[PDB]
């Protein structure tokens, strides 16, 4: 969802006009006004390619940021830009430990949330609280104040 | 007597092409109605799905 936000974003307002209108043309005499399964399917059937419908329930979960298990404009956005693999091409195993060693910079085995808030003030960027604990939760896995290396670890999933 | 022949071929054809066209439209008709009864219940099947999959989990 974040790197799909990030690309949605980064759309321009015309690329954004013509997503609206190829939603539209989606939901063409549809009764929830909304892409499903059913309204998913039939447009993969309308360009070629035949979609699984556990294949299709799991799209349509990495992409709703709602609930209602169907595609909106909102969503339609980045089912519409995921295209792009911003993810990929992992850091080396080195590297990730040289993440870990310099947001762990009192040599201990935990990035507490000092570390990361001080590391998010250093940046520069103008941090608000929400992100902070986003990214503390994003983090911390079992909440206990600090991000070990295997949370670490699970820390880099979406992140490039 | 050649444009009288023609003619009643002509009134004919028109007879049995008519009578095609409206087949034609019957079975538009009736292609529409299974399309969208056949849609309906591939949505009310997936919901299902959807809900056991819940379940199931
Ligand atoms: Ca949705
Ligand atoms: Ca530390
Ligand atoms: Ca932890």
Redesign the pocket.
Known sequence: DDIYKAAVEQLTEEQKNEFKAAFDIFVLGAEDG?ISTKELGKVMRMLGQNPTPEELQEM?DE??????????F??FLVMMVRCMKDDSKGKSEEELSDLFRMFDKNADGYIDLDELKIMLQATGETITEDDIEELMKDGDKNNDGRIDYDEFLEFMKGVE | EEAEKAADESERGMKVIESRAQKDEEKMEIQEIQLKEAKHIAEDADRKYEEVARKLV
Do not use: A, K, N, Q
């Open positions: 909304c349509i992409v709703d940021e709602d609930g209602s298990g169907t595609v909106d909102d969503e």
